[PDB]
Amino acid sequence: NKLHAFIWDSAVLEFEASQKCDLVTTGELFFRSGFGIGMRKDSPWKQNVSLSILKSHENGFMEDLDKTWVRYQECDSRSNAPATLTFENMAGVFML
Amino acid sequence: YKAGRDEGCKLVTIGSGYIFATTGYGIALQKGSPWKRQIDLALLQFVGD
């Protein structure tokens, strides 16, 4: 609670929100872009790197990377349904 | 787009927006075309603005 809001990439922030219970993303993605592998303007690896990225997208390799590294979930509690009452929620009536 | 414009909202994409190949639409050009750099920069500027 030192920073009220943090504006950052959707992937990293969503991973942090999934991992950490006390953090949550907001929504309304803006400045939709993509992570790229930067190389110098005059390089021999340009086309081959781009083709390998595309090929890894076509098959499931990038999906496998997402599954193993980004798409695993610890504590989410994210739903549109109304909250379920718990001990602390109505401990007052029990003490009453 | 079809799900958005669907009448009665009877059609939905599974997975709440599940995309598998996750590629993107591009502007095809001839191999080694001189327009690639300018078009790429213009598209990135449009996205940024």
Next chain:
Amino acid sequence: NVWNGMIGEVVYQRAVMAVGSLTINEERSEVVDFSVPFVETGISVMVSR
């Protein structure tokens, strides 16, 4: 071993550009020279609700 469609027009120099719903994949990007993807697409399944 002959390309037909918009990629076919671009490959055989009948069209400098191919604007439209043109998806980027490995073979097309091998035969033509795509630009930056200006909209996200990919395989997806649509079913009746």
